Design a protein around this ligand. Structure first.
Ligand SMILES: OC[C@H]1O[C@H](O[C@H]2[C@H](O)[C@@H](O)[C@@H](O[C@H]3[C@H](O)[C@@H](O)[C@@H](O)O[C@@H]3CO)O[C@@H]2CO)[C@H](O)[C@@H](O)[C@@H]1O
Length: 383
């Protein structure tokens, strides 16, 4: 009598056309562990949605699931993710950088197995921009069409971080709260107002389907997005036209300021409600193993986090893995694991309010007001 293990991950990992990585690796796990009598059932869900899916009812959720690490604290508070020990915890510490192990560490305990870094970067049309052009957003706007998903807080912050706005201090001090206040914040809001007023800027939609469509028809030539859409970007542009870069500067008041993406991880978590914790924990370890990460790279081009794969020649030569590494070293801030729910929620209507014709449109005349309103809402969400 087989036991059913229910595993949740994104559509791309369950798509046979992309090698169905998650199924492939679950089957490899079973073959490696003949003492287990198991079969698999799969739930399709983006890592970006795992908080909502699992915390609503953990007992109803998958046994093993793929999530984005900023969801860690709400998963813990919902009793929805198991502490990991033993060889699994040791692997997470030994095989990752300190920053990557920290992405899944809460109060000194490991709660998940990283399988890739989680950040974003620039895709661009090499027929439109040069390598030098894409160093500066301002230069780019003089040459071609630029998009950005401003109603997605995971992207929005890069602009505010560029001018010294902070989330929980360095990201780890809850008592510091949010600081988007003052002239430093208004200057960024003003830059974004000017960006929306630029006829070569096109706002991307929240999950980036607009940008992808624009790359294809030529109405957008630069796309800020991530590794998961690498194959779709190659389809849209044609592979010989795909440029991949780290983040540009923006010129605020004559000063070049560096856009800084969040850098976290995507990881495999174990549901405490799973009836076979031994199997679930070993499966999580397997899905984040070196072999499994290499397969993720070969099957659908996802960059590994395991540092022993950093010296793989194919990985080192890959333009997305390279850009992600550059974003890590030069263009990022560590993703807070202090819950940012209030920020994700507030960011979306704030970003939407830059649009021409929007209700309560953010303009030069009200930029300071709207900036303080945002800062106030963020800090109110902590009370
Ligand atoms: O927008 C708020 C949202 O921001 C974060 O979500 C981002 C993910 O962390 C990031 O990995 C990426 O999600 C993609 C998956 O990685 C990918 O496998 C596939 O499923 O597409 C997803 C994008 O559609 O982008 C999202 C932001 O769009 C944060 O983790 C969330 O908790 C937060 O709600």
């Amino acid at each position: 009598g087989k036991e059913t293990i229910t595993v949740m991950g994104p559509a791309e990992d369950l798509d046979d056309a992309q090698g169905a990585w998650l199924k492939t690796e679950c089957e490899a796990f079973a073959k490696a562990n003949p003492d287990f009598n198991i079969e698999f059932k799969y739930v399709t869900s983006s890592e970006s949605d795992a908080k909502d899916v699992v915390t609503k009812d953990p007992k109803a959720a998958a046994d093993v699931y793929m999530f984005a690490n900023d969801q860690l604290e709400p998963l813990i508070k919902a009793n929805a993710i198991a502490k990991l020990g033993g060889d699994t915890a040791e692997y997470v510490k030994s095989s990752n950088s300190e920053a990557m192990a920290a992405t899944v560490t809460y109060d000194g305990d490991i709660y998940a197995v990283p399988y890739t870094s989680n950040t974003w970067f620039m895709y661009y049309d090499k027929r439109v921009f040069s390598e030098d052009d894409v160093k500066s957003l301002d230069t780019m706007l003089t040459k071609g069409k630029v998009s950005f998903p401003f109603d997605n807080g995971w992207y929005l912050n890069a602009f505010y971080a560029a001018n010294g706005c902070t989330i929980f201090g360095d990201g780890t001090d809850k008592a510091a709260g949010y600081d988007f206040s003052g002239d430093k914040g208004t200057a960024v809001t003003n830059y974004i107002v000017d960006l929306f007023a630029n006829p070569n800027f096109v706002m991307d939609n929240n999950e980036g389907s607009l940008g992808l469509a624009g790359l294809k028809d030529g109405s957008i030539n630069a796309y800020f997005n991530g590794n998961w859409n690498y194959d779709k970007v190659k389809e849209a542009l044609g592979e010989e036209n795909v440029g991949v870069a780290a983040l540009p500067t923006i010129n605020i008041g004559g000063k070049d300021c560096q856009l800084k993406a969040f850098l976290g991880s995507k990881a495999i978590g174990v549901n405490p409600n799973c009836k076979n914790q031994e199997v679930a924990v070993k499966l999580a370890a397997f899905l984040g193993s070196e072999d499994a990460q290499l397969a993720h790279f070969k099957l659908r081009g996802q960059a590994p986090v395991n540092k022993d794969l950093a010296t793989n020649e194919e990985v080192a030569a890959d333009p997305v893995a390279a850009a992600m590494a550059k974003v890590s070293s030069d263009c990022s801030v560590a993703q807070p694991i202090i819950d940012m729910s209030g920020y994700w929620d507030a960011a979306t209507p704030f970003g939407d309010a830059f649009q021409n014709g929007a209700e309560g449109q953010i303009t030069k005349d009200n930029a300071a007001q709207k900036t303080e309103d945002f800062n106030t809402q963020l800090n109110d969400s902590l009370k």
